[PDB]
Design a protein around this ligand. Structure first.
Ligand SMILES: [Ca+2]
Ligand SMILES: [Ca+2]
Length: 701
């Protein structure tokens, strides 16, 4: 269905102005005028055409070839002319299971009809003539190398359409602009024409005529735009200027810490003294010069979980000579644009700056499923992976000494560093129109080139999580890379992250571009500064369509509402923003508050502090402990309930005097205390908080 001969249909007589490039599954190479909706009526007159591919016969025999227009045709089989401007009774011997190159040229001057009616026939030794069936025809080998059976070029005999990189798109289209439309089981590739195509919201493609994959990834410019590609490749990466590659990090969902058994004690009969905590993990990005790395950071729940106020050591019965042990549930997350099939990258679990506690490895070539873009492994509908799986007798214990365990308690942070070892690639095969994992093709052979020739943009507009995309961009000092289209910052945002501009205003899902900030590494910053100076522009937001990207730039774009740590994780926001987000209150009572809170805002709140203030202005903190601030919960109707009773002995607030104020403060992640202070103080004293509700008792009820 994606198989057959590849056809180039030209408006001119000499193979110079290609109007349509498309394939035909059978020897019916026609394009009826009804399919020429996206081309000007006057260009719908085709004066020449070239078809190429292979024929493979099901039975050896002598065949005679013929077309609908033998007087206008020259046809070559494996460099031999079989038709030369006249009908031929000549018979050529073809052997079963063998592949023969086919090239056909057609020239007509002043056709009176639009489109082209053209059929390729053959007749066997028994005088049975028919249009060549689909099972006999194959596409040209539009790859960077030949196969054992199929040569990547066509015989030098006759017309050669300029296709320097052999992807199947003519040089001239790649440079001047093209578009793709599907009509009737077929994809038509045609020249971009402003006054027909723009108003259809069709995409204008450009790509390098000298790079088979303009983004230096493993899928050709032609494969991408015609859908001859792994269906799991992200939609944005079907654009020849957007890189298709995996990006993998590890998400830890929860953790369990125990005391490690010892040679010395025979007693294994004891009471459970484990510590189980939920964990929150985010993919990170650091200002580290030239990082091309996968890392994530793990936050261990500091909310009150166990009785008393003991230290972890006390809870577990851990003394200074004992060792502790860690287990966890994790999943792999592909935030990139291409799938992984037969490997999973290796990961270091790290305490502090550089204390590696474990190496996490999956079994090579034994994946239970694909790891697809915007997805997880295992998929969310399945159980996650345990670091020490139940009856895995080969799983190395994750062990900590007493000081490390104490360090974990203090920081309540782990880091997961994941390498870029992603295994083999599923590529399109022009012989059978199938996509299959190619064991001779490895992501390790592709990543460096992608990283080297693209501009990287990292954007958190989607749920405040960091998403990286890479866009093909000129490298002024690399001749080949100068053959690629100019890429503007505006265009990059459109194609890589789906920004649009419905009213001449660049937006991401309703949010104006000005709601996001720009952050550049040193080189990128100097480059853009220089560009702005040349434009005599003082404000980047007003010249996004004039800023050009170059290979190796790094750009980070974040939602301005938030404060960010060094990992570019959102950890706070302005008092103003936080107050506004709680301002609209549904219900209030002695039991709690009922609120409607922005989904992103909630991400940066770690808790709430509830306090009653008497008339002399003295305050009584109801939940007065650093670990008692998680009193909010999200209801299944999406509202947030801040619950006063939770840490008030399950009792509604008692308000002695209706002139007393009930104040509720919000605490952001960056201001959260996760351990007692060194004086041992567990109180909320000194905690930086934001007043978000203050009502006298009688305004409350
Ligand atoms: Ca090409
Ligand atoms: Ca190309």
């Amino acid at each position: 269905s994606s198989q057959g001969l590849l056809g180039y249909y030209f408006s001119d007589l000499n193979f110079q102005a290609p109007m349509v490039v498309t394939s035909s599954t059978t020897g019916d190479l026609s394009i009826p005028s009804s399919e020429l909706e996206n081309i000007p009526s006057e260009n719908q007159y085709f004066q020449s055409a070239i078809w190429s591919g292979f024929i493979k016969v099901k039975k050896s025999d002598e065949y005679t070839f013929a077309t609908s227009a033998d007087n206008h045709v020259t046809m070559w089989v494996d460099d031999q002319e079989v038709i030369n401007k006249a009908s031929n009774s000549n018979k050529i011997r073809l052997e079963k299971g063998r592949l023969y190159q086919i090239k056909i040229q057609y020239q007509r001057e002043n056709p009176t009809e639009k489109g082209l009616d053209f059929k390729l026939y053959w007749t066997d030794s028994q005088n049975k003539k028919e249009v060549i069936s689909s099972d006999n025809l194959q596409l040209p080998e539009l790859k960077q190398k030949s196969s054992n059976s199929r040569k990547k070029r066509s015989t030098s005999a006759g017309p050669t359409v300029p296709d320097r990189d052999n992807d199947g798109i003519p040089d001239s289209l790649e440079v001047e602009g093209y578009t793709v439309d599907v009509k009737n089981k077929r994809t038509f590739l045609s020249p971009w024409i402003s006054n027909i195509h723009e108003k259809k919201g069709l995409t204008k493609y450009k790509s390098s005529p000298e790079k088979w994959s303009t983004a230096s990834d493993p899928y050709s410019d032609f494969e991408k735009v015609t859908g001859r590609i792994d269906k799991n490749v992200s939609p944005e990466a079907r654009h020849p200027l957007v890189a298709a590659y995996p990006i993998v990090h590890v998400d830890m969902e929860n953790i369990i810490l125990s005391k490690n058994e010892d040679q010395s004690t025979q007693n294994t009969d004891s009471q459970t003294r484990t510590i189980s905590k939920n964990t929150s993990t985010s993919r990170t990005h650091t200002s580290e010069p030239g990082s091309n790395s996968n890392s994530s950071t793990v936050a261990i729940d500091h909310c009150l979980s166990l009785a008393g106020e003991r230290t972890w050591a006390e809870t577990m019965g851990l003394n200074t000579a004992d060792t502790a042990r860690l287990n966890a549930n994790i999943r792999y997350v592909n935030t990139g644009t291409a799938p992984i099939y037969n490997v999973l990258p290796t990961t270091s679990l790290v305490l502090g700056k550089n204390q590696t506690l474990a190496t996490i490895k999956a079994k090579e070539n034994q994946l239970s499923q694909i790891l697809a873009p915007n997805n997880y492994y295992p998929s969310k509908n399945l159980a996650p992976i345990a670091l020490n799986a139940q009856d895995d007798f080969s799983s190395t214990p994750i062990t900590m000494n007493y000081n490390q365990f104490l360090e974990l308690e203090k920081t309540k942070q782990l880091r997961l560093d994941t390498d870029q070892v992603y295994g083999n690639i599923a590529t399109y095969n022009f012989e059978n129109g199938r996509v299959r994992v190619d064991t001779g093709s490895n992501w390790s052979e592709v990543l460096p080139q992608i990283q080297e020739t693209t501009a990287r943009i990292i954007f958190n507009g989607k749920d405040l999580n960091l998403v990286e995309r890479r866009i093909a961009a000129v490298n002024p000092s690399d001749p080949l890379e100068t053959t690629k289209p100019d890429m503007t910052l505006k265009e990059a945002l459109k194609i890589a992250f789906g920004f649009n501009e419905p009213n001449g205003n660049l937006q991401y899902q309703g949010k104006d571009i000005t709601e996001f900030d720009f952050n550049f590494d040193q080189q990128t910053s100097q480059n853009i500064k220089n560009q702005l100076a040349e434009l005599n522009a003082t404000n980047i937001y007003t010249v996004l369509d004039k800023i050009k990207l170059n290979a190796k730039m790094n750009i980070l774009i974040r939602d301005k509402r938030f404060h960010y740590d060094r990992n570019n994780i959102a950890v706070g926001a302005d008092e103003s923003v936080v107050k506004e987000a709680h301002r609209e209150v549904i219900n209030s009572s002695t039991e709690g508050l009922l609120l409607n809170i922005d989904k992103d805002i909630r991400k940066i709140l770690s808790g709430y502090i509830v306090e009653i203030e008497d008339t002399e202005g003295l305050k009584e903190v109801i939940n007065d402990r650093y670990d008692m601030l998680c009193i909010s919960s999200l209801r299944q109707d999406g509202k947030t309930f801040i619950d006063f009773k939770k840490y008030n002995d399950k009792l509604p607030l008692y308000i002695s005097n209706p002139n007393y104020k009930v104040n509720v403060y919000a605490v952001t992640k960056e201001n959260t205390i996760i351990n007692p202070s060194e004086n041992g103080d567990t109180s909320t004293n000194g905690i930086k908080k934001i007043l978000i509700f203050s009502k006298k008792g009688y305004e409350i009820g």
